[PDB]
Design a binder for these strands. Sequence first.
RNA 1: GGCGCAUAAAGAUGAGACGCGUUUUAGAGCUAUGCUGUUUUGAAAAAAACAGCAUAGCAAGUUAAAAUAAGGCUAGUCCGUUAUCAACUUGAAAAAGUGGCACCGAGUCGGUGCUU
Lengths: 130, 1364
Amino acid sequence: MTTARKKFYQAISEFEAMTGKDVERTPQIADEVLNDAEYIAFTKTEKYALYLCTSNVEGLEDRYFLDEECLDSTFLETEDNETYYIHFLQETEFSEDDNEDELPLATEEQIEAYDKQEELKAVILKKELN
Amino acid sequence: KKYSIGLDIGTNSVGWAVITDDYKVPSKKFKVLGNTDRHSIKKNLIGALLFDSGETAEATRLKRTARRRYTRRKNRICYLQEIFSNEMAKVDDSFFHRLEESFLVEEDKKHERHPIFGNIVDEVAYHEKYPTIYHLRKKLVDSTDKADLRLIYLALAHMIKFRGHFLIEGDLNPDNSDVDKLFIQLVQTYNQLFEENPINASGVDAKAILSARLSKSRRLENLIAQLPGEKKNGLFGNLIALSLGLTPNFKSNFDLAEDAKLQLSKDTYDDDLDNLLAQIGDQYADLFLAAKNLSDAILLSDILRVNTEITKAPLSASMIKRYDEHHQDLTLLKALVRQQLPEKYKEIFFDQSKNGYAGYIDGGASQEEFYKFIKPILEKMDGTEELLVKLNREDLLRKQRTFDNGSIPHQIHLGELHAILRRQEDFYPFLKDNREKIEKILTFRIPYYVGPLARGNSRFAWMTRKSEETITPWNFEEVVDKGASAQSFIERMTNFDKNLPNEKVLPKHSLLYEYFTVYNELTKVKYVTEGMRKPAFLSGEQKKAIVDLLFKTNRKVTVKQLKEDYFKKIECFDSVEISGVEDRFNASLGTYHDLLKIIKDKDFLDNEENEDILEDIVLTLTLFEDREMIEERLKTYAHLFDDKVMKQLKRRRYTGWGRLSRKLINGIRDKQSGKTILDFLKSDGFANRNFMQLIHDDSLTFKEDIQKAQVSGQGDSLHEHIANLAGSPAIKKGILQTVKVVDELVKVMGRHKPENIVIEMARENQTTQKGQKNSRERMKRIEEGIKELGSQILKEHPVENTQLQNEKLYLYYLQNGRDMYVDQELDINRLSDYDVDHIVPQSFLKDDSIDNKVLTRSDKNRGKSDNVPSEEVVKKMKNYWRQLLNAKLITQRKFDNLTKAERGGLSELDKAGFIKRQLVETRQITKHVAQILDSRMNTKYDENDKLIREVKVITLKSKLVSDFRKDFQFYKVREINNYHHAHDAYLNAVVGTALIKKYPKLESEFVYGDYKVYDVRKMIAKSEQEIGKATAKYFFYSNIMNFFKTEITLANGEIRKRPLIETNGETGEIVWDKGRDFATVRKVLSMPQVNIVKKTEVQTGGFSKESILPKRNSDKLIARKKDWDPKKYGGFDSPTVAYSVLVVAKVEKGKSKKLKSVKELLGITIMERSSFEKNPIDFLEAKGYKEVKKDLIIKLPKYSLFELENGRKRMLASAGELQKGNELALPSKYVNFLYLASHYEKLKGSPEDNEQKQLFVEQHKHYLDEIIEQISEFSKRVILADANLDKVLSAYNKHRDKPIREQAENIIHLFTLTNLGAPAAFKYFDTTIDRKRYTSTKEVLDATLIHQSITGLYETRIDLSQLG
RNA sequence: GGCGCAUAAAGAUGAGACGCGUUUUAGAGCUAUGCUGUUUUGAAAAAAACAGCAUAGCAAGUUAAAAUAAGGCUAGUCCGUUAUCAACUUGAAAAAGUGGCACCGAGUCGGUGCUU
């Protein structure tokens, strides 16, 4: 039990408390992905829309910068035959130092994806842990 | 002037409050230090401190054990390399120098490329001759021919780095190898544990059926088809399902409420096993042990399967066959894909990224993700047999190194190493006389007790040595000392008791601790036979008779067995019912029966002279674990023993400890009797008290003798003071910070010591919605209401059982569909006019429970007194109340409360129990922080030895401050600002001082200190209303908070006027001035400027994110070792910054390298922090900066306050992070309206109060269009986020006609736009908008910086504009 | 706060073994076509690949070695993620010390009096 292991287990416990309870065989994820994860999101589809935020970084205002970069997208199975996809996320520590690249910019495929994700609301409980 | 201090304690926060006598909090001009222009500040003297939660210390223990396991493994490799160090230079010189260089790029590698066999050709012949190492050692175990030396070495260096588990002990034998004897063992322990309606499996034999080649989720149905048992969800069947990886449940099986999931594959097996075991009792516990044992056995039969040529290679020769069923059954599948699907072949084997077979080896996948991906494809195919039957049994396309070969007993590896050295001993000289040493360094499991093998430089080790040289497992015995290290072992990780220190607590199942628990339960059990006409408890000789006549017979005994084997047998008592013990005893004499089975003697365990002998045999069993040291300490007691119990008594283990030591139970004696705790708790007499009531007693000597030794000897350091507390480390961090801020807070108010300091803490609202908690036991009562009553109320209206959180229908359905006042029925939809009354009025207690509240139609049905209701109402329903107590619809306490017509009403002991029931505050952290904060500021002496108690410590609950908050319209909801810490502490002062100034005499039960025994049985008048502030009694109305009530109100309508300006009842001093109290209190809770500070920290922790990631051309990677340049080898990214530094310097800008003046932040990671502070200017020249001004290097930790124009406060969390600092001056009427409107059905007070709040919100609907523009100009001043603000203004405009309750709840969720900390994204009505993080750290460089003190009172302001 | 059968629980700390996972290198990739040097009865050519790249189709595809927080000195089969911490003045460190009081008010504290 690490600082994030048992709270991941109570995370999927309250996921099983929110919906149909018959869950079985939680995925044995490694410690390397769990101990650097900011947000555990649950959803229905494998394609996860990732979030976004703006800034005031030396002009370039009202653009869209994604923050939660996926590093592990595994699934868990319930009884019977209903698939839910786990997603672990990491906050993007982008600074005010680049050659206007590798700071994550919009590339508006994710913008339209977030529009559909917010309009349909397929997101399930998304909570912070460390 | 006198003053008083109030303290809220928490995890995140701590609140400090300073009041005078007149309750106007002071306000003082403080001095500013630095080089700014504001030479004086004028601040209030009231505030809070919030900070990061105090993390525990389990992650550091985990990382430390990982580091030491890796260092032990590398040095086992070092020993085995050193034993071949001579003759491997004979074969090929730089061979070990190349196995050390197996990681770097071939260009800077200083040898040839191929590690083994040197050249190119023999390496390829090695791979296509030996495909893997399991094939290699499965070859050369059965090889008469001589093998190559480096070949045997690389077979053996793999052999000792993967050793298995040492959870099994001894050597393997068919009593512990195969599943036959283990399944016989579990059916024996099941048959022995129940000894009734059993099951026997002598006919069916699961030695091959449970070991078969099938699917486990079908194999348990096979076994329940063979052995009948109970069912497919029976307890025997569910435990077999636990033995095969499945996760059954037991709520339908134990006849228990909550479900019970169990599996062995999770890391948290034991923490859930004891969690369920405390719910069900310990009498099953060892049986589950065998279950886990049985499970491991079948997993053994999963890996080793070939039993035909099973000699000399049971492991390696097995799963190479699995390699064969991987190989051809790969090709088959390829020969089944291209024939039928030419598409989805490029995305299966050339994919690399989509959970296919390409990602199953060359990428990131698992067995189960790949099985789920090829389920729909391969299940779709037309002709594919022997694959779906192989997929459900988890054995296709399956690698060697699973996550489920963590069930390898090391003896298998040791046996094939034994063979691998026997079949080479005939050839090589050095290897013939070192096989003992090689097998020894394989099997050397460094034991628990011998600790870290240190040489005094440790912080954690304790083992001592009989010599001084380099420690090897060659010679582990004659170097380290056994008995001295064991003696230092037992005293180090013993646990002292908080109830009595300097003592070693007893084990969890000692004989003495078991007698303690059974005599703590049996001293509160009461029996009723026909003839006593009033219930009575047991006597001492009855307790001796029942522990000699029923407990020695069976482990668990029910009340039926009690009344049919004791009252009927020798007492000749027949018509007896027992109220105390419910149905069974949760306390059990398990090890009594256990050691009775082990020694097979009845005299010896029952003889009272062998007590320390038995308890320290149990102590040395529960303390040690390995098989060697466990036996010679029993050789001390080898005189009594019979040499057949040696292989029997050393088998049982224990885990966990009790609660209290031996010197506290059978230790100290009474000054007037000479008896111990146990001596009274089996021989007391008629006053059948309890143990905790004996702790709760004041008059007896034992509690005072406890608090004699609860203080230490000489006063320790304050870190050593907090070192032996309890709780989380978070509240320990809070306690240390609140002692620091008190000890600094005395300094600021003229250095005069205070008068009254108040403390409390409260937290942990994690009930998880209580949706199934009612229907598990409480609502489930009506399911045994059918057992007694018969009225199936849900049969006429099935109403759901998860929305019972509304209290009125909840208390209706907990009332049989009836009334407890008059014989009638009720309307379910007309419950709004029906009234909720209380069994005891609001002038005697305060509680909102089912024990208090009842529901009815008319208040006249209760009665016309403030006492218990009338005699006819209890006696006309004395029949039915015995049923709804018998159906367990209500508890015993409220039924005994209504039947006070027998006891006259409010008895003197009863009203004493109510008047002190609120003020007994029995949480240990409160008493210990009281002791710590007493012993610091209250230490002056006089002409005698006793202490001048200068400053009064005082300790109040959260109930009184919550009531003073609620009843007088002083509301709070947590999500507005973080002022609700500090303001909370303020009320903790007021209800503090205005209770001690008004009650001087009755402070002798909730001040920490030696005071009198002056009780309350003669402090409350047993008659009518006595003289106002001139009488002998303290009060009559048992609710303490009627003192604060301007005008009390009870159900009789007697609107009795307690006087306006109240004066204390013995000395004549005004304590509570009505015309100048609530004006002052409502002014101070509406004050705008409170000093909250976020304290600074240096970020200790990990170097970088714990996930090394593959190579890339970006230079911001952190290397693995020194010379592994991460543009080739990759590694760590995103380092954690500990603290930034503000540096003024010059850079070599331009093509002419001209030194231009710069002033910037620079992040410093923890990687070079010590490298920073050993020499800062040389490291900064190495970074690439010149002209370092050493005085001007400004250290700037995380959470540092920057203030700039229009009062904008931003606080700096990293080099490129900022967090909002300012907060809201939101006045009292707005917060009162927001709490009252946002809980339109969530107050549960009076119907008149309901119409008052309804008309209040309907007249003050004018507020939600002024809150919005306050937030508008506020966020336009201090946030400057225009876009999302305009979005939420338009979104507010779009819901203008929305109803009130939903709009108030959405506006308190809207408040989190403007808290402190990092900004977040908030759930609005619909328009969930994006967070706006700040990274533009340029504006910080020209602002002002505040190095503030710990309480925020003291401060200094440094400027960065002219900083040059 | 849930004191919840009216109790009040018990709490944190420390030793050992795994089994994984991750990352580089080693497991000579092959065939065909098209781009880069040279050879040759030679005048650049006539073209042979020995090597490198790209594009299509084929073949296998499991296992190892190293490291698993940079490293440190106190050189151990030790230690390096927790508890510890505003500046300033002392002090190696420990630890000590560094700031005027009332009154009228309140938009993140302001204003007035007296005074070392």
